[PDB]
Amino acid sequence: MSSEYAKQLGAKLRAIRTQQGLSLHGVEEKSQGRWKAVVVGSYERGDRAVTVQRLAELADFYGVPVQELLP
Amino acid sequence: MSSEYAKQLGAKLRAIRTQQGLSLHGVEEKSQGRWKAVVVGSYERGDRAVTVQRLAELADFYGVPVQELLP
Protein backbone atom coordinates (compact mmCIF):
# COMPACT_ATOMS: atom_id res chain seq x y z
CA MET A 1 0.00 0.00 0.00
CA SER A 2 1.07 3.60 -0.58
CA SER A 3 2.79 5.35 2.33
CA GLU A 4 -0.07 7.83 2.54
CA TYR A 5 -2.71 5.09 2.59
CA ALA A 6 -0.83 3.08 5.23
CA LYS A 7 -0.32 6.22 7.31
CA GLN A 8 -4.00 7.20 7.12
CA LEU A 9 -5.23 3.67 7.84
CA GLY A 10 -2.95 3.56 10.87
CA ALA A 11 -4.27 6.93 12.05
CA LYS A 12 -7.86 5.68 11.98
CA LEU A 13 -6.83 2.52 13.82
CA ARG A 14 -5.23 4.72 16.49
CA ALA A 15 -8.25 7.05 16.66
CA ILE A 16 -10.75 4.22 17.11
CA ARG A 17 -8.58 2.58 19.78
CA THR A 18 -8.14 5.76 21.83
CA GLN A 19 -11.77 6.76 21.26
CA GLN A 20 -12.95 3.83 23.35
CA GLY A 21 -10.41 4.53 26.08
CA LEU A 22 -7.87 1.80 25.34
CA SER A 23 -4.10 2.27 25.52
CA LEU A 24 -1.87 -0.09 23.52
CA HIS A 25 -1.32 -1.99 26.78
CA GLY A 26 -5.08 -2.07 27.25
CA VAL A 27 -5.50 -3.66 23.83
CA GLU A 28 -2.97 -6.38 24.66
CA GLU A 29 -4.79 -7.05 27.93
CA LYS A 30 -8.32 -7.04 26.53
CA SER A 31 -7.25 -9.30 23.66
CA GLN A 32 -5.61 -11.77 26.05
CA GLY A 33 -2.36 -11.05 24.21
CA ARG A 34 -3.65 -11.73 20.70
CA TRP A 35 -3.02 -8.12 19.68
CA LYS A 36 0.40 -7.14 21.03
CA ALA A 37 1.05 -3.48 21.85
CA VAL A 38 4.22 -3.38 19.74
CA VAL A 39 2.46 -4.88 16.72
CA VAL A 40 -0.66 -2.70 16.94
CA GLY A 41 1.65 0.28 17.38
CA SER A 42 3.48 -0.61 14.17
CA TYR A 43 0.13 -0.83 12.34
CA GLU A 44 -0.84 2.59 13.69
CA ARG A 45 2.39 4.19 12.46
CA GLY A 46 2.06 2.45 9.11
CA ASP A 47 5.41 0.72 9.64
CA ARG A 48 3.91 -2.77 9.28
CA ALA A 49 1.43 -4.00 6.67
CA VAL A 50 -2.16 -4.50 7.82
CA THR A 51 -3.81 -7.27 5.76
CA VAL A 52 -7.51 -7.25 4.93
CA GLN A 53 -8.00 -10.24 7.25
CA ARG A 54 -6.17 -8.45 10.08
CA LEU A 55 -8.12 -5.23 9.50
CA ALA A 56 -11.40 -7.16 9.69
CA GLU A 57 -10.26 -8.86 12.91
CA LEU A 58 -9.31 -5.52 14.47
CA ALA A 59 -12.59 -3.92 13.40
CA ASP A 60 -14.48 -6.70 15.18
CA PHE A 61 -12.26 -6.36 18.24
CA TYR A 62 -12.92 -2.62 18.45
CA GLY A 63 -16.60 -3.18 17.74
CA VAL A 64 -16.72 -0.93 14.68
CA PRO A 65 -17.48 -1.51 10.97
CA VAL A 66 -14.44 -1.91 8.70
CA GLN A 67 -15.59 1.23 6.87
CA GLU A 68 -14.84 3.35 9.95
CA LEU A 69 -11.17 2.38 9.67
CA LEU A 70 -10.78 3.01 5.92
CA PRO A 71 -8.93 6.18 4.78
CA MET B 1 -3.67 -13.85 4.77
CA SER B 2 -4.76 -17.44 5.36
CA SER B 3 -5.48 -19.52 2.26
CA GLU B 4 -9.12 -19.84 3.30
CA TYR B 5 -9.51 -16.10 3.84
CA ALA B 6 -7.84 -15.27 0.52
CA LYS B 7 -9.98 -17.87 -1.24
CA GLN B 8 -13.21 -16.55 0.28
CA LEU B 9 -12.33 -12.91 -0.37
CA GLY B 10 -11.61 -13.79 -3.99
CA ALA B 11 -14.92 -15.62 -4.26
CA LYS B 12 -16.85 -12.55 -3.12
CA LEU B 13 -14.88 -10.38 -5.55
CA ARG B 14 -15.87 -12.78 -8.33
CA ALA B 15 -19.51 -12.90 -7.20
CA ILE B 16 -19.88 -9.11 -7.09
CA ARG B 17 -18.23 -8.75 -10.51
CA THR B 18 -20.44 -11.34 -12.22
CA GLN B 19 -23.51 -10.11 -10.34
CA GLN B 20 -23.40 -6.82 -12.23
CA GLY B 21 -22.85 -8.55 -15.56
CA LEU B 22 -19.14 -7.90 -16.03
CA SER B 23 -16.67 -10.44 -17.42
CA LEU B 24 -12.98 -10.05 -16.58
CA HIS B 25 -12.56 -8.47 -20.02
CA GLY B 26 -15.47 -6.17 -19.19
CA VAL B 27 -13.70 -5.03 -16.04
CA GLU B 28 -10.54 -4.20 -17.98
CA GLU B 29 -12.60 -2.24 -20.49
CA LYS B 30 -14.76 -0.36 -17.99
CA SER B 31 -11.68 0.52 -15.92
CA GLN B 32 -9.85 1.83 -18.98
CA GLY B 33 -7.23 -0.83 -18.29
CA ARG B 34 -6.60 0.07 -14.65
CA TRP B 35 -7.88 -3.33 -13.51
CA LYS B 36 -6.36 -5.95 -15.81
CA ALA B 37 -8.28 -9.19 -16.38
CA VAL B 38 -5.27 -11.34 -15.48
CA VAL B 39 -4.68 -9.44 -12.23
CA VAL B 40 -8.33 -9.38 -11.14
CA GLY B 41 -8.49 -13.07 -11.99
CA SER B 42 -5.54 -13.77 -9.71
CA TYR B 43 -7.27 -11.86 -6.89
CA GLU B 44 -10.43 -13.91 -7.44
CA ARG B 45 -8.54 -17.21 -7.21
CA GLY B 46 -6.64 -16.00 -4.16
CA ASP B 47 -3.34 -16.47 -5.98
CA ARG B 48 -2.31 -12.83 -5.53
CA ALA B 49 -2.55 -10.69 -2.39
CA VAL B 50 -5.32 -8.09 -2.30
CA THR B 51 -4.24 -5.13 -0.13
CA VAL B 52 -6.72 -3.09 1.89
CA GLN B 53 -6.14 -0.14 -0.44
CA ARG B 54 -6.77 -2.32 -3.50
CA LEU B 55 -9.89 -3.85 -1.94
CA ALA B 56 -11.27 -0.38 -1.23
CA GLU B 57 -10.53 0.70 -4.81
CA LEU B 58 -12.28 -2.38 -6.22
CA ALA B 59 -15.28 -1.89 -3.93
CA ASP B 60 -15.67 1.65 -5.26
CA PHE B 61 -15.27 0.43 -8.83
CA TYR B 62 -17.99 -2.18 -8.38
CA GLY B 63 -20.16 0.32 -6.54
CA VAL B 64 -20.51 -1.77 -3.38
CA PRO B 65 -19.48 -1.28 0.27
CA VAL B 66 -16.23 -2.97 1.32
CA GLN B 67 -18.27 -5.05 3.77
CA GLU B 68 -19.99 -6.86 0.88
CA LEU B 69 -16.61 -8.22 -0.21
CA LEU B 70 -15.41 -9.38 3.23
CA PRO B 71 -15.49 -13.14 4.03
PDB file of C-alpha atoms in Angstrom:
ATOM      1  CA  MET A   1       0.000   0.000   0.000  1.00  0.00           C
ATOM      2  CA  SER A   2       1.067   3.599  -0.585  1.00  0.00           C
ATOM      3  CA  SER A   3       2.787   5.345   2.325  1.00  0.00           C
ATOM      4  CA  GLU A   4      -0.074   7.827   2.544  1.00  0.00           C
ATOM      5  CA  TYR A   5      -2.714   5.089   2.593  1.00  0.00           C
ATOM      6  CA  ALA A   6      -0.828   3.079   5.228  1.00  0.00           C
ATOM      7  CA  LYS A   7      -0.320   6.221   7.306  1.00  0.00           C
ATOM      8  CA  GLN A   8      -3.995   7.197   7.119  1.00  0.00           C
ATOM      9  CA  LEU A   9      -5.225   3.668   7.842  1.00  0.00           C
ATOM     10  CA  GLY A  10      -2.954   3.563  10.875  1.00  0.00           C
ATOM     11  CA  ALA A  11      -4.265   6.926  12.050  1.00  0.00           C
ATOM     12  CA  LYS A  12      -7.857   5.683  11.979  1.00  0.00           C
ATOM     13  CA  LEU A  13      -6.826   2.520  13.825  1.00  0.00           C
ATOM     14  CA  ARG A  14      -5.235   4.721  16.494  1.00  0.00           C
ATOM     15  CA  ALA A  15      -8.245   7.052  16.656  1.00  0.00           C
ATOM     16  CA  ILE A  16     -10.750   4.217  17.106  1.00  0.00           C
ATOM     17  CA  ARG A  17      -8.581   2.584  19.784  1.00  0.00           C
ATOM     18  CA  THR A  18      -8.141   5.762  21.832  1.00  0.00           C
ATOM     19  CA  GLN A  19     -11.769   6.758  21.262  1.00  0.00           C
ATOM     20  CA  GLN A  20     -12.950   3.826  23.353  1.00  0.00           C
ATOM     21  CA  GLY A  21     -10.412   4.530  26.085  1.00  0.00           C
ATOM     22  CA  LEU A  22      -7.872   1.803  25.343  1.00  0.00           C
ATOM     23  CA  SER A  23      -4.100   2.268  25.516  1.00  0.00           C
ATOM     24  CA  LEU A  24      -1.873  -0.085  23.522  1.00  0.00           C
ATOM     25  CA  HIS A  25      -1.319  -1.992  26.775  1.00  0.00           C
ATOM     26  CA  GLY A  26      -5.083  -2.066  27.247  1.00  0.00           C
ATOM     27  CA  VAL A  27      -5.502  -3.663  23.829  1.00  0.00           C
ATOM     28  CA  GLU A  28      -2.971  -6.379  24.662  1.00  0.00           C
ATOM     29  CA  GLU A  29      -4.790  -7.052  27.929  1.00  0.00           C
ATOM     30  CA  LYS A  30      -8.324  -7.041  26.533  1.00  0.00           C
ATOM     31  CA  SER A  31      -7.254  -9.304  23.657  1.00  0.00           C
ATOM     32  CA  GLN A  32      -5.613 -11.768  26.047  1.00  0.00           C
ATOM     33  CA  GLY A  33      -2.362 -11.051  24.212  1.00  0.00           C
ATOM     34  CA  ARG A  34      -3.648 -11.730  20.701  1.00  0.00           C
ATOM     35  CA  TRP A  35      -3.021  -8.117  19.684  1.00  0.00           C
ATOM     36  CA  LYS A  36       0.404  -7.139  21.030  1.00  0.00           C
ATOM     37  CA  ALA A  37       1.046  -3.476  21.849  1.00  0.00           C
ATOM     38  CA  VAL A  38       4.218  -3.384  19.741  1.00  0.00           C
ATOM     39  CA  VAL A  39       2.455  -4.884  16.719  1.00  0.00           C
ATOM     40  CA  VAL A  40      -0.656  -2.702  16.944  1.00  0.00           C
ATOM     41  CA  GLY A  41       1.648   0.277  17.376  1.00  0.00           C
ATOM     42  CA  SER A  42       3.478  -0.611  14.170  1.00  0.00           C
ATOM     43  CA  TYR A  43       0.135  -0.835  12.341  1.00  0.00           C
ATOM     44  CA  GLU A  44      -0.839   2.587  13.688  1.00  0.00           C
ATOM     45  CA  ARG A  45       2.386   4.188  12.463  1.00  0.00           C
ATOM     46  CA  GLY A  46       2.064   2.450   9.106  1.00  0.00           C
ATOM     47  CA  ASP A  47       5.409   0.716   9.638  1.00  0.00           C
ATOM     48  CA  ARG A  48       3.909  -2.771   9.283  1.00  0.00           C
ATOM     49  CA  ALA A  49       1.429  -4.000   6.669  1.00  0.00           C
ATOM     50  CA  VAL A  50      -2.164  -4.495   7.815  1.00  0.00           C
ATOM     51  CA  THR A  51      -3.809  -7.268   5.759  1.00  0.00           C
ATOM     52  CA  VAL A  52      -7.508  -7.249   4.931  1.00  0.00           C
ATOM     53  CA  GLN A  53      -7.997 -10.235   7.249  1.00  0.00           C
ATOM     54  CA  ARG A  54      -6.167  -8.452  10.079  1.00  0.00           C
ATOM     55  CA  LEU A  55      -8.123  -5.233   9.500  1.00  0.00           C
ATOM     56  CA  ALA A  56     -11.396  -7.160   9.694  1.00  0.00           C
ATOM     57  CA  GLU A  57     -10.264  -8.859  12.909  1.00  0.00           C
ATOM     58  CA  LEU A  58      -9.307  -5.522  14.471  1.00  0.00           C
ATOM     59  CA  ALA A  59     -12.590  -3.921  13.405  1.00  0.00           C
ATOM     60  CA  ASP A  60     -14.476  -6.705  15.183  1.00  0.00           C
ATOM     61  CA  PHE A  61     -12.256  -6.355  18.242  1.00  0.00           C
ATOM     62  CA  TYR A  62     -12.918  -2.621  18.449  1.00  0.00           C
ATOM     63  CA  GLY A  63     -16.605  -3.180  17.740  1.00  0.00           C
ATOM     64  CA  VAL A  64     -16.724  -0.932  14.676  1.00  0.00           C
ATOM     65  CA  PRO A  65     -17.478  -1.509  10.970  1.00  0.00           C
ATOM     66  CA  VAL A  66     -14.438  -1.911   8.704  1.00  0.00           C
ATOM     67  CA  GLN A  67     -15.587   1.226   6.869  1.00  0.00           C
ATOM     68  CA  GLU A  68     -14.836   3.354   9.948  1.00  0.00           C
ATOM     69  CA  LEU A  69     -11.170   2.376   9.665  1.00  0.00           C
ATOM     70  CA  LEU A  70     -10.775   3.008   5.923  1.00  0.00           C
ATOM     71  CA  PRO A  71      -8.929   6.177   4.775  1.00  0.00           C
TER      72      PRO A  71
ATOM     73  CA  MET B   1      -3.672 -13.848   4.773  1.00  0.00           C
ATOM     74  CA  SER B   2      -4.765 -17.439   5.363  1.00  0.00           C
ATOM     75  CA  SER B   3      -5.484 -19.517   2.258  1.00  0.00           C
ATOM     76  CA  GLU B   4      -9.116 -19.842   3.302  1.00  0.00           C
ATOM     77  CA  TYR B   5      -9.508 -16.097   3.842  1.00  0.00           C
ATOM     78  CA  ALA B   6      -7.838 -15.269   0.516  1.00  0.00           C
ATOM     79  CA  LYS B   7      -9.982 -17.867  -1.244  1.00  0.00           C
ATOM     80  CA  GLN B   8     -13.211 -16.550   0.285  1.00  0.00           C
ATOM     81  CA  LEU B   9     -12.326 -12.906  -0.371  1.00  0.00           C
ATOM     82  CA  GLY B  10     -11.607 -13.795  -3.985  1.00  0.00           C
ATOM     83  CA  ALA B  11     -14.923 -15.621  -4.261  1.00  0.00           C
ATOM     84  CA  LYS B  12     -16.846 -12.547  -3.118  1.00  0.00           C
ATOM     85  CA  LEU B  13     -14.875 -10.380  -5.548  1.00  0.00           C
ATOM     86  CA  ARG B  14     -15.872 -12.779  -8.333  1.00  0.00           C
ATOM     87  CA  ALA B  15     -19.509 -12.901  -7.203  1.00  0.00           C
ATOM     88  CA  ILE B  16     -19.880  -9.112  -7.093  1.00  0.00           C
ATOM     89  CA  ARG B  17     -18.232  -8.746 -10.513  1.00  0.00           C
ATOM     90  CA  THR B  18     -20.438 -11.338 -12.218  1.00  0.00           C
ATOM     91  CA  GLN B  19     -23.513 -10.107 -10.345  1.00  0.00           C
ATOM     92  CA  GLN B  20     -23.401  -6.820 -12.228  1.00  0.00           C
ATOM     93  CA  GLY B  21     -22.850  -8.551 -15.560  1.00  0.00           C
ATOM     94  CA  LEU B  22     -19.136  -7.900 -16.034  1.00  0.00           C
ATOM     95  CA  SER B  23     -16.666 -10.439 -17.421  1.00  0.00           C
ATOM     96  CA  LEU B  24     -12.976 -10.051 -16.577  1.00  0.00           C
ATOM     97  CA  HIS B  25     -12.563  -8.465 -20.018  1.00  0.00           C
ATOM     98  CA  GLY B  26     -15.473  -6.174 -19.192  1.00  0.00           C
ATOM     99  CA  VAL B  27     -13.703  -5.026 -16.036  1.00  0.00           C
ATOM    100  CA  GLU B  28     -10.535  -4.203 -17.977  1.00  0.00           C
ATOM    101  CA  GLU B  29     -12.601  -2.240 -20.489  1.00  0.00           C
ATOM    102  CA  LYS B  30     -14.758  -0.361 -17.988  1.00  0.00           C
ATOM    103  CA  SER B  31     -11.681   0.525 -15.918  1.00  0.00           C
ATOM    104  CA  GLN B  32      -9.846   1.835 -18.983  1.00  0.00           C
ATOM    105  CA  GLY B  33      -7.228  -0.832 -18.289  1.00  0.00           C
ATOM    106  CA  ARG B  34      -6.601   0.066 -14.649  1.00  0.00           C
ATOM    107  CA  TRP B  35      -7.882  -3.330 -13.506  1.00  0.00           C
ATOM    108  CA  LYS B  36      -6.362  -5.950 -15.812  1.00  0.00           C
ATOM    109  CA  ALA B  37      -8.282  -9.188 -16.383  1.00  0.00           C
ATOM    110  CA  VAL B  38      -5.268 -11.335 -15.478  1.00  0.00           C
ATOM    111  CA  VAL B  39      -4.684  -9.444 -12.226  1.00  0.00           C
ATOM    112  CA  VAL B  40      -8.332  -9.381 -11.138  1.00  0.00           C
ATOM    113  CA  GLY B  41      -8.493 -13.072 -11.986  1.00  0.00           C
ATOM    114  CA  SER B  42      -5.535 -13.774  -9.711  1.00  0.00           C
ATOM    115  CA  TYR B  43      -7.267 -11.864  -6.895  1.00  0.00           C
ATOM    116  CA  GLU B  44     -10.426 -13.913  -7.439  1.00  0.00           C
ATOM    117  CA  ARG B  45      -8.544 -17.211  -7.207  1.00  0.00           C
ATOM    118  CA  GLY B  46      -6.641 -15.998  -4.157  1.00  0.00           C
ATOM    119  CA  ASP B  47      -3.335 -16.472  -5.981  1.00  0.00           C
ATOM    120  CA  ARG B  48      -2.311 -12.827  -5.534  1.00  0.00           C
ATOM    121  CA  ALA B  49      -2.555 -10.694  -2.390  1.00  0.00           C
ATOM    122  CA  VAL B  50      -5.323  -8.086  -2.301  1.00  0.00           C
ATOM    123  CA  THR B  51      -4.242  -5.126  -0.134  1.00  0.00           C
ATOM    124  CA  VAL B  52      -6.719  -3.094   1.893  1.00  0.00           C
ATOM    125  CA  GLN B  53      -6.138  -0.137  -0.442  1.00  0.00           C
ATOM    126  CA  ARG B  54      -6.770  -2.319  -3.505  1.00  0.00           C
ATOM    127  CA  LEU B  55      -9.888  -3.853  -1.940  1.00  0.00           C
ATOM    128  CA  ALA B  56     -11.268  -0.380  -1.229  1.00  0.00           C
ATOM    129  CA  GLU B  57     -10.533   0.698  -4.808  1.00  0.00           C
ATOM    130  CA  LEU B  58     -12.282  -2.375  -6.215  1.00  0.00           C
ATOM    131  CA  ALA B  59     -15.284  -1.889  -3.928  1.00  0.00           C
ATOM    132  CA  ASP B  60     -15.675   1.651  -5.263  1.00  0.00           C
ATOM    133  CA  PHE B  61     -15.265   0.428  -8.834  1.00  0.00           C
ATOM    134  CA  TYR B  62     -17.987  -2.183  -8.383  1.00  0.00           C
ATOM    135  CA  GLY B  63     -20.159   0.322  -6.535  1.00  0.00           C
ATOM    136  CA  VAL B  64     -20.511  -1.769  -3.380  1.00  0.00           C
ATOM    137  CA  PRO B  65     -19.482  -1.283   0.273  1.00  0.00           C
ATOM    138  CA  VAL B  66     -16.226  -2.972   1.315  1.00  0.00           C
ATOM    139  CA  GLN B  67     -18.273  -5.048   3.772  1.00  0.00           C
ATOM    140  CA  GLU B  68     -19.989  -6.856   0.880  1.00  0.00           C
ATOM    141  CA  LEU B  69     -16.607  -8.219  -0.207  1.00  0.00           C
ATOM    142  CA  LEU B  70     -15.413  -9.378   3.226  1.00  0.00           C
ATOM    143  CA  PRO B  71     -15.488 -13.136   4.030  1.00  0.00           C
TER     144      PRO B  71
END
